[PDB]
Design a binder for this molecule. Sequence first.
Ligand SMILES: CC(=O)O[C@H](C(=O)O)c1ccccc1Cl
Ligand SMILES: CC(=O)O[C@H](C(=O)O)c1ccccc1Cl
Ligand SMILES: CC(=O)O[C@H](C(=O)O)c1ccccc1Cl
Ligand SMILES: CC(=O)O[C@H](C(=O)O)c1ccccc1Cl
Ligand SMILES: CC(=O)O[C@H](C(=O)O)c1ccccc1Cl
Ligand SMILES: CC(=O)O[C@H](C(=O)O)c1ccccc1Cl
Lengths: 319, 319
Amino acid sequence: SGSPGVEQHTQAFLEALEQGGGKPLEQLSPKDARAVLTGAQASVKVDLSGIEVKERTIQANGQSIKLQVVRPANVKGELPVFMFFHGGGWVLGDFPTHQRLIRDLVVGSGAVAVYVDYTPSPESHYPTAINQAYAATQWVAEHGKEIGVDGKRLAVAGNAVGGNMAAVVALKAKEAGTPALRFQLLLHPVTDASFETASYKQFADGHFLTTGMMKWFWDNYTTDAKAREQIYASPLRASSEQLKGLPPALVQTAEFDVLRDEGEAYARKLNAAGVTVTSVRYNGMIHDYGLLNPLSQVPAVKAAMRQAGTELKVHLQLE
Amino acid sequence: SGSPGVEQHTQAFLEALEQGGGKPLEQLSPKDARAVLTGAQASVKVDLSGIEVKERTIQANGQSIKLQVVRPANVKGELPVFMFFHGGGWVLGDFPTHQRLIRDLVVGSGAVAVYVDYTPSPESHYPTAINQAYAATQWVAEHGKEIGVDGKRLAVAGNAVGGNMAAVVALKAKEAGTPALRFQLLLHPVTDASFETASYKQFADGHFLTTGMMKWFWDNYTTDAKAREQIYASPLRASSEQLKGLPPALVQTAEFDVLRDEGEAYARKLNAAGVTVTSVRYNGMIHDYGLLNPLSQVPAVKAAMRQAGTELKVHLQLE
Ligand SMILES: CC(=O)O[C@H](C(=O)O)c1ccccc1Cl
Ligand SMILES: CC(=O)O[C@H](C(=O)O)c1ccccc1Cl
Ligand SMILES: CC(=O)O[C@H](C(=O)O)c1ccccc1Cl
Ligand SMILES: CC(=O)O[C@H](C(=O)O)c1ccccc1Cl
Ligand SMILES: CC(=O)O[C@H](C(=O)O)c1ccccc1Cl
Ligand SMILES: CC(=O)O[C@H](C(=O)O)c1ccccc1Cl
């Protein structure tokens, strides 16, 4: 478990995982793997106060798409808004597993989150979910009044493959010429369908997210090699010209995460393309510390969450 | 100038420095070198609003020590407080060169800064300044009412050698058993009188702070090898037992800073000793981005400053 330099509570978490192992996640059926995350997130008392949650089903992408709209409690008027794309490696995850993370971003930013219930993998494959994600984002931009938001002040946010999804939705919005986006919040994003970065090599196991999981996640998403080479799957492969004009980004990475290097590399490519980027590595931390309910009271995690909420707020102001 | 991955405005700054060079800083007299920083900081329009500045001379350390007390404007009552220790490699720096940085921390935190006017080097040598710094911190703890602060809610903060000073004052407070400190804010701290870390090797020149400057700074501070080995000069040399019980820390480092590795290493040692630490590397950034007035409008720099102010605020609340 862990490494020299892992933050103390995080290291204890890793050791607890190592104890009483269980089968590797990637050896489970999608149903059983989904239940592992559900059970783990439900195992910890967490503050979910300060929010008003309501479901809305929309017609877009030529289908019905379910949204969970999460609004700061006791606030009147149209509020700015961020789309929220959940992580879980495409196979896992949903709204309640991610509700604490979403709640923290909403309460900290004062903005409304719109969770999009994209179709999981392998039930669907690329590009089904990203097309749903984009469709919902366009819908919010043009129909925001219906759910109490100002669709002209619109960001995208997500963790892990949700960070992939947020980045790709920003690219799709550029491709489509609409909608205008204020900001992209990328928390430990997946950015490349390749597994040879220094961080992938160093943290292959023992640090929660493993290389084995990442390959399984990608395989469930799509085994089409040409699909994986597209910028809408692996945005790290985009040229400077393709990245030009994307909205300002905050990218948080974790020191002990296989995805650390590709996230920081994507931030560099955005910067080289003239996009405004803040790229921050949280040392001592593991992958997706912001999702994990058992880590939500770690002081560094709280600091990272204060930052994520504040930066959403900064970019969602009037004028 | 610079490297692949340097944030765009920062890279332009580095290129401007390279153009129209001038003599290396470390070849100048202390007087002339001091004027270089003064002139550069004065070259940029910056917001200094929202603060009330007043000088106070105190009797401590068996001498007179000048303080600049920087209070949020239009606020009544006793406020919590952080000591502020300026950087400049011991040779350079003062209050006005650092006033924008201090102002940003005050306005963002809502807490009062107490700048300590320690004796520069080589006019004095180790341990004169750190003894003054500690003496002033103890004074504020016990006499805070006189300058409108709650001395029981007291943090230490500083940039570069000021980060060294803040860390060392926390160690001296532990050694003395007083005063109680809420928090240490270390912005790109100097932590070791050695020059062989990977970051020292990689960024030896071309990134504002050079290895040559750092060696000159240390030489002016003290050439006593035994002094440099003391934990009050090089706190990285402290054992876990020596670090045990120190106050919670936020350490910000910069990706392209010779001091990056020793700062992150000190954060690791604090964590190993059970101290609460948040260690954050701002990618794309150079050394002491928070001091430099020409960089104060870079978005990543603004985000880092919002974080520094917020974390001071978090740790200076009642109860
Ligand atoms: C990677 C794994 O095996 O799942 C963990 C477990 O409960 O074992 C786990 C632990 C805490 C939070 C989430 C998850 Cl998913
Ligand atoms: C790459 C991805 O999306 O990461 C997931 C995440 O942490 O969100 C994840 C990774 C490992 C175990 C559980 C979960 Cl849920
Ligand atoms: C778990 C947690 O609350 O850590 C806090 C935070 O960073 O929010 C914190 C808040 C106030 C004082 C100390 C500390 Cl450590
Ligand atoms: C390191 C050096 O030579 O000083 C710089 C210069 O003006 O050349 C400089 C530039 C901007 C801000 C401060 C300073 Cl000190
Ligand atoms: C090590 C130190 O204290 O760094 C100074 C700082 O950036 O504060 C500094 C470094 C290079 C040039 C000017 C100045 Cl002022
Ligand atoms: C120079 C600067 O203000 O950048 C800002 C910041 O991060 O504070 C900012 C604020 C609102 C919207 C965009 C941007 Cl980029």
